[PDB]
Design a protein around this nucleic acid. Structure first.
Lengths: 120, 118, 120, 121
DNA sequence: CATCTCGCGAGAT
DNA sequence: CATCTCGCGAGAT
């Protein structure tokens, strides 16, 4: 996978630290949405699920998960943006490998519920 | 975050001597001094700052998040950031306080929604 | 903005209640002019616009509005004076927040009349 | 009741400050159970919901809330017991009245889900 | 499932 | 009225 550049969402925001091209991804979140996100998410857990709601439509979340495998045709949550969220969580919160694993189980859990309600 | 030129003759929410905790706003200085004089608590200043910053028609269709059963719009996050910056810089409120103040703001918009349905 | 003191208009008058310094502005209106105003304006609406004609020249009213923003180079009507006008209407009439809103539209509407005719 | 006596549950346990007769309530939690609570509940928020389950059966929780006032004809969780929970969480975590307030919505929300299962089974 | 926390209408100050 | 704060159902974690 390849990183991107500002020209990919000129009206967007950087996930990660803008200073480190090795660990930064541009995304479509406009700055005011990010102001709100960075204001109301006091843990890496809650900002990871919130960034997700802001980057993956729940139509997509219902048919997707991290690995793109599993029953019922699970597609794969776009990897450039998943790299973005990890870049951001480590930038803002300094998460560990232990942490990222839990955040990955909750990302998948959230997509599981999005699928759960296209069922009902 | 905005610059002063966004409202040449407006006012600053928050600390003017902190470019990260200040939001230029359209409140005229006349009115701001009145807000600083006759709003002696964070809770009242929040609800009256709200009315100087958002028409009651925006308030009716809006809540703090944009989520909700009602297809609601979201109160401009730059302005809400300034409300918050200002309440910190004058009353020095905690985030617990800020949390409970924030429920009052949803509550106000929610009664605005009620009136708009009458 | 900063309140003034009596020494700013010794032959002037006080807008507001003279007893708390935090809600009184000294203005240049002579007391005789003030006697005519209080006897002749039986509403805050009417007194605000009459007060305005006594503190802002029509020259100035035509160029200005309350925001100092808008089209055609609006200048901001002096805030200390505006603070005084509202200090006065709450002293004499007890106006509410809703009331102050319409009166601000009146003041601005009246500034529009002064500008429309400056170039008729 | 009024701040009960230890004879009310001779072989039970104390909620709160044992050497403070106004901030202690005697309850029927057996001592092995209380030890388990003291060991495995590491926060006031979990201790409250866990204590709830040891002092009120599910069927009581279903038709109860903290105040007794509700759109439904609810009953009130025995205020003496709720006092003890409160005394306890403060005795062993030094919780704020702000905390107690938020913890008390958690209690009310738990009984609310107990209501939900009773009508789903 | 247990628990947290939300948006909500409407009763209380 | 304007504002506080409640009980609630249910989504989020």
């Amino acid at each position: 996978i390849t990183l991107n550049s500002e020209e990919d969402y000129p009206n967007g925001t950087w996930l990660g630290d803008e200073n480190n091209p090795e660990m930064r991804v541009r995304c479509a979140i406009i700055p005011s949405d990010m102001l709100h996100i960075s204001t109301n998410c006091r843990t890496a857990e809650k900002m990871a699920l919130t960034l997700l709601d802001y980057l993956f439509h729940r139509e997509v979340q219902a048919v997707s998960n991290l690995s793109g495998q599993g029953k019922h045709g699970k597609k794969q949550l776009d990897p450039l943006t998943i790299y973005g969220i990890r870049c951001h969580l480590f930038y803002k919160f300094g998460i560990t490998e232990s942490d990222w694993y839990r955040i990955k189980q909750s990302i998948d859990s959230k997509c599981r519920t999005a699928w759960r309600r296209k069922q009902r």
